Design a protein around this nucleic acid. Structure first.
Ligand code: MG
Ligand code: MG
Ligand code: MG
Ligand code: MG
Ligand code: MG
Ligand code: MG
Ligand code: MG
Ligand code: MG
Ligand code: MG
Ligand code: MG
Ligand code: MG
Ligand code: MG
Ligand code: MG
Ligand code: MG
Ligand code: MG
Ligand code: MG
Ligand code: MG
Ligand code: MG
Ligand code: MG
Ligand code: MG
Ligand code: MG
Ligand code: MG
Ligand code: MG
Ligand code: MG
Ligand code: MG
Ligand code: MG
Ligand code: MG
Ligand code: MG
Ligand code: MG
Ligand code: MG
Ligand code: MG
Ligand code: MG
Ligand code: MG
Ligand code: MG
Ligand code: MG
Ligand code: MG
Ligand code: MG
Ligand code: MG
Ligand code: MG
Ligand code: MG
Lengths: 101, 87, 70, 116
RNA sequence: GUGGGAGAGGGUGGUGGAAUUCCCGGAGUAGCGGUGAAAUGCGCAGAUACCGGGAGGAACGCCGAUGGCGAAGGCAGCCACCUGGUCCACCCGUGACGCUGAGGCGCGAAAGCGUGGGGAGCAAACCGGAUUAGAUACCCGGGUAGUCCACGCCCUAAACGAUGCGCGCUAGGUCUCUGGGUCUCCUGGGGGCCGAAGCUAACGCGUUAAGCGCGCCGCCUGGGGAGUACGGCCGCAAGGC
């Protein structure tokens, strides 16, 4: 199992009924693919640099997990299925390379 | 790939003695394992030709060590080959 | 002129999510600055370029912008 | 018949012609002119004089709809690309800002033999 | 072996924005385009220019480099999986296991061929307009095979460093990529430039040798005829050795 980082940007128009559903859906997809979650950071409403799906903002999520490597591309396929989910980028974790140290 | 967990498991299995990391039996064992990792990677991915080159170099190196074992001590050569199922 | 690394702190070159610092490395347009203007090293600029492109796909850094002059 | 009084002005400047469009803040055009709308016919359209007269013709057409404030957008390099802007500031239209939005691809389409 | 390292190395799937083209709608008149000038072309069935939305294919701007990887061909968005090569530090292990390499086998830009897809831009042939003494051309408007994908052929090249590979030896200075280090620097492994000795017909090469040596393979022996004829092998063909 290697350690990855998940970036999810979804439609920033959801109420709490839909936001809890979309996110507990994301939890259910991680369970079925065996992702032991290590920590979470939620930024939420953030000004985008260009329109995405005709929408000027995006609701941002970030998960850091440890999961089997073979199942990553299928986990990406499972997250983009939701209409409200717009951006899904999964990156293998790396060391914080410092500059001007 | 090939993690150090699987690596030590092979070296300790084919070491002529504790601490041996470079015996001819150990190199051929290690070579043979990476041979099988690649030959199964090349069953699929038949169009990966640059990886196909690395395989031909490992086979040559594996046969180069076996041809050596044959000349010095042919018994350990048979004990090795029978243990790895080659030729 | 000053260079970007000259006037800055100790920052993570691999963090694609820190837009405030990565905005400094873009020009008036969304273009990536040359090494002459960033004051970075060879290995540093190569890492910056990849982390900038990541922030672009996340909608955080612009692919291109509009110049207001001329 | 619109009474817009503020809007955008796009300058499409090519080496063969310079053409001006005046729109409202939403992008929909109001009037327009070019090097061919004025008397010029051939290569005389891609000249800075034709670029100047074309800019001034659309400006006076926008005076009919009541334009005062103008935002300027420029696309393309060509003779008279600058002469059109200079004609627009002194056209009576108070020029709000000037932006260059010339579309540059990311190396997506194969150009004609001329451009290689 | 152990522990680290950099990378358009490769294969697979996925994915992002810009741009071109086309469709839909809004808005909007009289031309756009193109050239040294023009004309064919397109435009009142409403184009060009502008805004919004949609579809499709192909290629990845800035970073970008006189850079990096690869055995060569060659490899640039980004993400993940599979994966090859290589380099450094430790001086741990085997104990000459090495170098080259006629055959063989595998790879091999582009173009071309087969079957089935795909088809936006470009574009042989070809259809036009010009130029011209003529235009079977450069310039302009269109445009098919093709360029792209899958599977199988084809085996050529200025396939170039016009320099086969491996090793040892023979002043340095400077620029650089990447490691380690007691980190004005030292020490490795690549990529450039000047230049000792020396070599070379000269231009030039010069610790990346074209120098001094050694091992092995390939190949050369006047031009035209001619990479043609015949024969053979291979190929569906074009044609190749
Ligand atoms: Mg979705
Ligand atoms: Mg003209
Ligand atoms: Mg790659
Ligand atoms: Mg690839
Ligand atoms: Mg329409
Ligand atoms: Mg007509
Ligand atoms: Mg008509
Ligand atoms: Mg008609
Ligand atoms: Mg189509
Ligand atoms: Mg460049
Ligand atoms: Mg190299
Ligand atoms: Mg080349
Ligand atoms: Mg690797
Ligand atoms: Mg020792
Ligand atoms: Mg010893
Ligand atoms: Mg001993
Ligand atoms: Mg060899
Ligand atoms: Mg051979
Ligand atoms: Mg070929
Ligand atoms: Mg081809
Ligand atoms: Mg074909
Ligand atoms: Mg064309
Ligand atoms: Mg043509
Ligand atoms: Mg003549
Ligand atoms: Mg004629
Ligand atoms: Mg010669
Ligand atoms: Mg020689
Ligand atoms: Mg250091
Ligand atoms: Mg060197
Ligand atoms: Mg001399
Ligand atoms: Mg000589
Ligand atoms: Mg020299
Ligand atoms: Mg030498
Ligand atoms: Mg010969
Ligand atoms: Mg003769
Ligand atoms: Mg021939
Ligand atoms: Mg004969
Ligand atoms: Mg024959
Ligand atoms: Mg035959
Ligand atoms: Mg021929």
């Amino acid at each position: 199992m290697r350690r990855y980082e998940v970036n999810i940007v979804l439609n920033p128009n959801l109420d709490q009924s839909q936001l809890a559903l979309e996110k507990e859906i994301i939890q259910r997809a991680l369970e079925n693919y065996g992702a032991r979650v290590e920590k979470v950071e939620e930024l939420g409403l953030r000004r985008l640099a260009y329109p995405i799906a005709k929408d000027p903002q995006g609701y941002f999520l970030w998960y850091q997990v440890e999961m089997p490597e073979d199942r990553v591309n299928d986990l990406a396929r499972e997250l983009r299925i939701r209409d409200n989910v717009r951006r899904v980028m999964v990156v293998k974790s790396q060391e914080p390379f410092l500059a001007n140290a | 790939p090939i993690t150090k967990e699987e690596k030590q498991k092979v070296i300790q299995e084919f070491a002529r003695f504790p601490g041996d990391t470079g015996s001819t039996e150990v190199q051929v064992a290690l070579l043979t394992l990476r041979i099988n990792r690649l030959s199964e990677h090349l069953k699929v991915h038949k169009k990966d030709h640059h990886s196909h080159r690395g395989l031909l170099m490992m086979v040559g190196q594996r046969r180069r060590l076996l041809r050596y074992l044959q000349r010095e001590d042919p018994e350990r050569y048979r004990a090795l080959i029978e243990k790895l199922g080659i030729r | 002129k000053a260079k970007v690394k000259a006037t800055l702190g100790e920052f993570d070159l691999r963090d694609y999510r820190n837009v405030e610092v990565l905005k400094r490395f873009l020009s008036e347009t969304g273009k990536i600055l040359p090494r002459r203007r960033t004051g970075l090293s060879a290995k540093e600029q190569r890492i910056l370029a990849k982390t900038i492109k990541r922030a672009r796909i996340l909608g955080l850094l612009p692919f291109t912008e509009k110049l207001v002059r001329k | 018949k619109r009474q817009v009084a503020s809007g955008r002005a796009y300058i499409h400047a090519s080496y063969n012609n310079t053409i001006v469009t005046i729109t409202d803040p939403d992008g929909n055009p109001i009037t327009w002119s070019s090097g061919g709308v004025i008397g010029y016919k051939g290569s005389r359209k891609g000249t800075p004089y034709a670029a100047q007269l074309a800019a001034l013709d659309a400006a006076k057409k926008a005076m009919a709809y009541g334009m005062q404030s103008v935002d300027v957008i420029v696309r393309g390099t060509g003779a008279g690309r600058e002469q059109a802007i200079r004609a627009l500031q002194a056209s009576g239209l108070q020029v709000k800002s000037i932006v260059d939005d010339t579309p540059v691809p990311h190396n997506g389409c194969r150009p004609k033999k001329k451009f290689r």
